[PDB]
Symmetry: D2
């Protein structure tokens, strides 16, 4: 089994305040489950080859997704911003598989990714533990 534990840091009140609005798990590698402990979020997966997505909404209406998973025994991550309301995590998560339009990010197996939304909000996923079955990463909004 693999687990990915996330700590969420929000740096700039000017960007508004984000909260989780959805949490999905892909069905490969025997699925997996989200859990919360001590303000953190952990995705536990049955093995290598699946992932999960947290969607956040800010109190200013901004919608963004954070994807994390394990591909061929190495961690990966992605962030998608500027989402329309109909673009739920339920739509986003599957797009990393079956030759979908986000599969290329999963294939990169990134230990760190950052992007700034068109409206000017910075997002970063940075793994602090990058190897093994017990992975750790910070998610930073700014």
């Amino acid at each position: 089994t693999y687990s990915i534990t996330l700590r969420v840091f929000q740096r700039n009140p000017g960007r508004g305040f984000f909260s989780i609005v959805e949490k999905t798990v892909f069905h490969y590698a025997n699925g997996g489950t989200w859990s919360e402990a001590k303000g953190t979020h952990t995705l536990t997966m049955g093995g290598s080859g699946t992932s999960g997505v947290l969607r956040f909404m800010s109190d200013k209406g901004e919608l963004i997704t954070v994807a994390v998973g394990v591909h061929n025994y190495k961690r990966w991550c992605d962030v998608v911003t500027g989402l329309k309301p109909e673009e739920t995590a339920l739509v986003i998560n599957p797009q990393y598989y079956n030759n979908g339009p986000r599969a290329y990010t999963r294939e990169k197996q990134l230990a760190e990714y950052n992007v700034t939304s068109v409206v000017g909000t910075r997002f970063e996923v940075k793994y602090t533990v990058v190897e093994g079955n017990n992975l750790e990463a910070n998610v930073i909004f700014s």
Copy 2:
């Protein structure tokens, strides 16, 4: 817009203790978002015609989903038990649409549904406010 607010009651420690492991939102009617307040869970949707799913796991390993939505301006609900680990809410939610194998439950527009899992855990969704745009329901595990 429509919202559905859920209160979770767990009646029997013998059945183990359930916690949320996933929360999905379908993409129709401009999507929607889950939020938490005062121990309750609210699904807010852009209009009639979509839904969301909470998946729970008990500390005994039992996996079950609760679906709630609005179909043609009337509330609906469903409960699926005896799920395999790979049967995530990401798999379940879409099955209520596009002629999927659960669409028939959505079409019933039930204000109340109950089922007992094969392993003997009772589950009930019971709307306490059954009309209008601000719907309320109890989810009872037993």
Copy 3:
């Protein structure tokens, strides 16, 4: 150190739905801290000789406290119901020490306690692991 992990079961929707409105930790035995994980609540204490209180409020307005702790290396618990709004957990927790009017309950070192409020709500604390440093209990509202 000692920890007490609580699972909260609510059996009867007719009594309303309770949520936590306060969490205190008494200052003996090097203090301690409340944490949440997988829908459970854990009080971690620096040793034997302290306690914490969760105050709950129902959406019908009922106020009650659950006290748990370790006294001379044995778990204890108590429940106070019929609380006025000014009787916060900050008032209640210290009443178990120093000639306070609730000290006698701590001294009993109960592994189980139940009481029914004047307004008709049953409450029970029942330890499921009653010995050692890693204690477990179910809190049942009925």
Copy 4:
């Protein structure tokens, strides 16, 4: 009644990640209650003249308290850092009243307060809505 809603921003992962370990409510003005909604924390009070404290612990072990309240119809706040494990919120909250050593901070009715801990962690409370019965503030760890 008065309410104070807090949004918690954590800016610097190098300081560790803070989570709430205690929430107290002082017993004046008919008490009050903490609630959580959409990742925010609200203290609702029965009137002017009381307060509540959130104690936070970082995953590096740092202990700090944030106090907010209303004194003579004006908001107040304070932050205490460098706390020992025995200095729980239950000890700290009452020190703002009755000739306690922190009463002077309540009397200042600050709409903003900042302080840096001896171990180097910056903390700020900044009210974004500073008047009326529905107050709002950002709590910023840096």
